[PDB]
């Protein structure tokens with residue numbers, strides 16, 4: 001009996017269950033008595049009396065009850081997975097030929113729910129043996145797999161209440177923007193526990209609908225050009241190095257890099273503005289400037305020290321390292337605002353954690369334990385671990401003040417992320433998406449990966465929410481303008497209420 005998969009609070013995300021399959025013996029070959037038949041005689045009337053319990057298709061049933069030289073028949077999917085009452089109901093009616101075989105099915109109480117984390121187990125029909133095909137099911141299969149030995153349970157950090165907030169919000173963003181890719185992740189700011197994680201498009205582990213359309217888990221196995229969320233790590237390196245003074249002025253506008261003209265987003269700039277306002281506006285010239293002040297060799301190192309270009313070493317299979325793009329000054333200067341370099345969303349959460357743990361990066365984790373439920377032996381137990389301390393408490397407190405302004409500055413271009421009654425901070429991102437098949441960047445009206453790396457309450461946050469949407473195929477203009485504010489706001493507002501945060 002395959003092990004359970006539980007959430008933070010012992011609520012069930014996957015379990016084995018006893019269901020029943022319907023079998024009808026149609027062929028008259030059980031004729032040792034016409035008075036005591038063991039096959040289906042009146043087809044019309046046998047068909048009608050189980051319509052009362054099954055899908056109620058008396059014609060489709062009577063149709064299927066008519067085949068060629070087959071003793072037994074099944075009724076595909078609507079005649080598998082039937083309750084223990086559905087058995088006793090059909091057994092009371094004493095129909096001849098009709099029996100119900102027991103079947104052990106894998107059952108996901110919440111259906112489409114953390115589907116790409118939890119994964120799916122598939123049944124060998126010959127043995128009823130279940131094998132994990134993706135996610136926790138696949139990773140921890142040997143632990144979950146079971147004279148009759150009962151398999152070990154896997155406990156996640158996922159909180160079913162928060163996971164719901166995330167599932168509703170991403171459901172809305174698909175109706176509004178129908179994007180090619182989309183994800184949101186809630187993490188405990190102070191522990192690095194994944195409290196909630198979802199992505200679209202995804203599958204239903206229960207029904208199996210859409211399974212194997214996308215193998216890739218967004219949090220761990222998919223890489224992105226992060227965009228301007230990645231500026232927080234460059235700003236931290238610059239604050240530590242001395243390059244960044246919020247009140248010093250810099251020449252905004254553009255820079256000429258290996259002959260190409262990389263410019264601020266409004267193209268003109270704002271002339272000489274303070275570096276604080278530079279960041280608040282998301283000036284690429286500020287970041288290319290700070291890179292010149294600090295040094296190309298010193299900045300590759302600073303990115304490496306924030307955990308980039310190498311795997312977080314988490315519990316997920318085939319975790320992507322990504323890569324720091326640093327082969328020519330065009331790659332380095334574009335890396336400063338999160339193009340060329342590829343990240344995993346989990347790398348970004350590891351990095352971002354440093355601003356709230358006095359400079360200590362938290363290794364993010366979702367598996368809480370693997371225990372036998374009889375013996376109570378923990379074969380594995382996860383905990384808060386430090387992944388690096390790339391910056392000082394001071395650097396961190398100052399990166400925080402900039403993230404506060406990005407949202408709450410009177411000249412903010414990101415007030416769409418404010419939440420009535422809770423103070424929020426973070427950094428926005430709009431980024432070009434590499435074309436799957438070489439061909440530089442995806443073309444179109446606004447062919448962007450919009451993203452936000454927020455946290456609340458500000459300075460001493462309970463949670464970090466990192467949502468990202470890639471290539472909205474509808475309201476693509478509103479996508480560019482609002483990014484992921486329509487997912488961030490509800491996810492964050494409901495998660496703070498549920499953790500009883502004041503206001």
Ligand SMILES: *C(=O)[C@@H](NC(=O)Cc1ccccc1)[C@@H]1N[C@@H](C(=O)O)C(C)(C)S1
Pocket residue numbers: 226227228229264265281282284337338428429430431432448
């Ligand atoms: C960071 O990713 C920056 N993005 C770019 O410079 C690329 C870009 C994409 C669309 C339009 C113009 C430029 C800055 N990040 C976003 C943001 O802060 O939301 C901006 C569009 C302001 S530029």
